[PDB]
Assembly symmetry: D2
Homo-oligomer: 336 residues x 4
């Protein structure tokens, strides 16, 4: 299965890295081509050198129209409109990993199907008229039939395993989320006009706490249908370049203790959902490959009379945790 | 009323600034002397130049044993033990603003009473065997009798006005707090041994999200006695040098909407408790003089069936909001 | 003289602030209109709230097509092509302050002359076929005849007064500059494709030391003709959001001591060229109104045998120092 | 050869990491014991988790009096006075790697010789009454006779290979250095009293450009005796947590071009002195094992008439480059 990566951004590049570094374990798939808005020279440089995830342990260079890794060539295009990228005919692209941020719906990502690609996995929420898959939570809903699929967001991936565990073990009546989240490239380096015009998005990212909207909690029903309508929340964007944490405050159907909550959630531990009691901080999270890293040291159950609130917290490398999830889904997708 | 400032740190210096810049409005009080562990040369320099709060708009210099502001001299001591600072006899100190972080209890801050000072206001939580005052919430509990008093923490000051309003308007059954908080000098510049040995406190402060304990919510009953035992919470320390935000998630006794919550809390607006709907971010908070700045744009009420959670959020300049509160209490304290 | 500001970016907004806050002293000029690529709502918000320069001490709001300051209306356009902005006919614009970064040459900035504006002052180097003015150094070259003029760069303004003083007092044989410089909006928040494709410009700005090209030293002859061909240098972009410092290493025509150098440069002190011996750091520089702030504490003259190198260093608020210079030139320009 | 590490700080921990990760290549040496001011629990945690250098790929834990790596125990002491650490009798310590920053002279580091250790290598400049070794430049001066030896500073290690190459190839008449340098734990997290009382050291480190003194250039004659008295310079401390760059501006004895300079310096390439033309930035430098990484892309030779200045620039991971150098010297020291 021949993969075209649309948008060699943070996610597109890390997906390239993860696929290659899985080696044997990613045999069914291989990246064959890439599309962006820039030179092969720059794409190769950014794959090689990463300010947050370190230097790629391979030999990378460019030609006039490709990047080269360990001797193998990967074609690079600069086609702003997806139906125009000729990588099916040129490169045998079967499958698009859509990571530009500009095709986040079924309608839009049809452009790749017009281009002759067979399947698209979108690196973002892309609406409710397709499936959203969080690997480890509802990847068994995925079939070979599916043409265009969403991998959700980083926050979706951080949240779904934790709420899945809580729902199955205790039941969630209602809940509200705050994710303390790294800055991303939708934000501004310094205060100035920002695409979309949001007064907070416009503010210098690496010197402010900036409240942000997020639909991750609100849309959780696409992944965990039982919690439809039960959750909401928001984000605070803070000055780290990567590394994020999701807090959830729930009313559960049963009276619990922190220890009982921790014990129940540990039952769900997996490559997708880690359990980490080592008193870590955000920079230790970088490079972790689970989609969500539950932190039992932050669990807090607050009780007065018959009323009880349950706070549970999971870390995530918003870039790399998400990427590794996408790759898990990609590998399953391929095995179909 | 002659004030000695013990600990010319962030709080001690800003209190000096605020008192001076109130001018006429701080007539009953004047700083006469200062104690720390360092040279007058350095104390004067740090009063003048501040990386977060800008340059003090006065002429500052030092002698061999004092700082000088606009021509007036303020004696500087370097006495590690408070009962040894001779500023009562030397300088007529009546009253200590205790801001070292090293005398945060009644027993310890008795050292100043041994030194011959009459009253102490402590710039921090100092236990339950004295009063903790949040100006605008329970300063009417304060009498002339009181000898050693706590001004609570920055977080206490951020939280109490918001919960006071909620308790009086709707009633709080239970609640849990997360404050997304600037780094402070208890933290480390780079990973290394930290006083107290905490594995998270030890981590580089300006490059990590770092979970932190805080008793602000748990101890709120000292300020708002009705909420005794009803609240808990924690902190996330993030890479801003000042500027913090407190989120509270409550179960209230009544069903509310966000708009109803916002409207009710606005009734409590005061110099101590601001209401700011302008879509600000943390750097806009710097220099604000309220103890707590309610942000109605972040209000979120999440409902499923008969169950409802209410999230309310207030900003605070952890350094300067707190300082201005302390000064309000100080001015009232003096008017007694 | 009616001013249109093209590009309400960092420079355009700060120029608006500086003009207003000069009050009486900016009587000959007034901003009447603004052009950018965004909503009045956002422009008003960003004028009011600034992450680095604090909140503007005025009442700011927007209508559907203007910003409003203290009751007065300023028309806002969103015209990507300058010959299309109708602010001459609509608003009586006489004069354009060109601050978009997209018209940095005589040819391009003719677009405003086609639009019917009489004069342009460009907030950047714009070639050698017009005058470049550093106020305090060669503003006496400016006449009423001039139609399109350059105010140089921030670095030009930091460098020219220092080299002017050195050239007139000792003579410069040759010199090389390094400016340690705040990040700017030409850089990336996180590693990714950057306009122009530069492999270093592409790197995350707030987490790297990033070498950068600059022609400030090389082109100094446009401002100080005697030093034509004598200087070169570069920049290191570092993680501060504003605040910069220029080091120059010279061979001079005479043997000097640090003290002699400091004494000679102090003779040139002016509103444009400050002299500051208070051991400041970059955050103290923010808001300073001189174009260049000489720091005698950093002067170092290194001698072996008959050979001598002279290092001199000046701070600058790259945003605000430059802006205040531009405004000085603007006020002189108007007085013609 | 049994090594005690005094001061399990950034350098002490990274040296532990480097020794272990050399495996076979560090056979002659092994760390047996550690001394600091803190709990084994914390030391183990900080060895395992590093905010800048990532997670150590080993199993780390503590007992009540030791750290444990991959099953092997390393004794931990908390002895403030070095002559009191009993690790010779207890642990067979032969050799001290002195990394506390508190024993940086021959006299002081004699304390370990009183404790019964045979040799000390000090992780810092420690005066002129012993040898200072920069591996790759003058490690052939080292003998078995030497008891207490200095490994210089990070900056010394960055500078010496570059000046060695220049001196041998062209001759240096005079030169001046500026190192743009990461913040270190001598600095303050926020403005406040700093050990030693320096007005600049006192300033918040992660939000300022801060000029700093350094004797690296001035003392270079201890390593490259020919350049005695020929060099000086200083530092600018900037907000990165690690990763530094040294610029040198020289008058050379011969007229050169940039290309000739680059070509000559490349002749000196070694494990200790790297040559890197890939347009890197500071975060790419982290983890590099050379003491100095020459960057030919920054070379600039500026000529007017018969006068010429030569700017050459080398990167260094101030923590890890230095550490790997120390370990090279340690391995040679042991082979004696
Ligand atoms: N960064 C995160 O933490 C994260 C986590 C989960 C999901 N996501 C989602 O992943 C997507 C990309 O995120 P990112 O952080 O990689 O963004 P990015 O800005 O780093 O990358 C976007 C890339 O797409 C390229 N591009 C833009 N428009 C294009 C077009 N028309 N055709 C081809 N290439 C185009 C850009 O040049 C850029 O290289 C977004 O949908 C984002 O919401 C991001
Ligand atoms: N920084 C905040 O946001 C904030 C907010 C509210 C409350 N507080 C509390 O205020 C107190 C001080 O905080 P800070 O941020 O000003 O700390 P800081 O480190 O900036 O200042 C502490 C000052 O006390 C001096 N000092 C230490 N020990 C001393 C002693 N024995 N005698 C005299 N001086 C001594 C130190 O030299 C330093 O200048 C602490 O209790 C802190 O918890 C801080
Ligand atoms: N920031 C500094 O330190 C500094 C110092 C001296 C000189 N300069 C120069 O000043 C100019 C602007 O710098 P900045 O920091 O203000 O940039 P900025 O990105 O903050 O502002 C640029 C503004 O121009 C607007 N704009 C872009 N294209 C436009 C167009 N076609 N028509 C109208 N508006 C348009 C953008 O929307 C933005 O608001 C550049 O030439 C820069 O080199 C900057
Ligand atoms: N960090 C760098 O980039 C770097 C580079 C080259 C040289 N150095 C030098 O290395 C030495 C240490 O630097 P660092 O960055 O590791 O400092 P650090 O603060 O990270 O470590 C110092 C360690 O020594 C411990 N310590 C302090 N006093 C002690 C005592 N009396 N007995 C035992 N342990 C004690 C401290 O608890 C701390 O863990 C200093 O001399 C520094 O100048 C540092």
């Amino acid at each position: 299965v021949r993969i075209g990566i649309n948008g060699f951004g943070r996610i597109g590049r890390l997906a390239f890295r993860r696929i290659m570094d899985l080696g044997e374990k990613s045999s069914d798939i291989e990246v064959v081509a890439i599309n962006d808005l820039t030179t092969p020279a720059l794409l190769a440089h950014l794959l090689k050198y990463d300010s947050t995830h370190g230097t790629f342990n391979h030999e990378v260079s460019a030609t006039d129209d490709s990047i080269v890794v360990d001797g193998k060539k990967y074609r690079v295009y600069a086609e702003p409109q997806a139906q125009n990228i000729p990588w099916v005919k040129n490169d045998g692209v079967d499958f698009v990993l859509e990571c530009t941020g500009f095709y986040t719906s079924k309608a839009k990502s049809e452009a790749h199907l017009k281009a002759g690609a067979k399947r698209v996995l979108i690196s973002a929420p892309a609406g409710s008229d397709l499936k959203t898959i969080v690997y480890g939570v509802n990847d068994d809903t995925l079939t070979a039939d599916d043409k265009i699929v969403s991998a959700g967001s980083c926050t979706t991936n951080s949240l779904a395993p934790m709420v899945n565990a809580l729902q199955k073990e205790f039941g969630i009546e209602v809940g509200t989320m705050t994710t303390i989240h790294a800055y991303t490239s939708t934000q501004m380096l310094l205060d100035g006009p920002v695409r979309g015009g949001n007064l907070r998005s416009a503010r210098a990212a690496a010197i402010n706490i900036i409240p942000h909207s997020t639909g991750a909690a609100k849309a959780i029903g696409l992944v965990v249908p039982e919690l439809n309508g039960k959750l909401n929340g928001h984000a605070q964007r803070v000055p780290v370049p990567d590394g994020s944490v999701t807090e959830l405050v729930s009313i559960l159907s049963k009276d619990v203790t922190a220890d009982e909550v921790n014990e129940a959630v540990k039952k769900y531990e997996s490559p997708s959902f880690a359990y980490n009691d080592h008193n870590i901080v955000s920079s230790d999270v970088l490079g972790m490959t689970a989609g969500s890293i539950f932190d039992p040291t932050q669990t807090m159950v607050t009780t007065a009379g018959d009323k009880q609130l349950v706070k549970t917290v999971a870390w995530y490398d918003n870039e790399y945790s998400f990427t590794c999830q996408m790759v898990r889904t990609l590998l399953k997708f391929a095995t179909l």
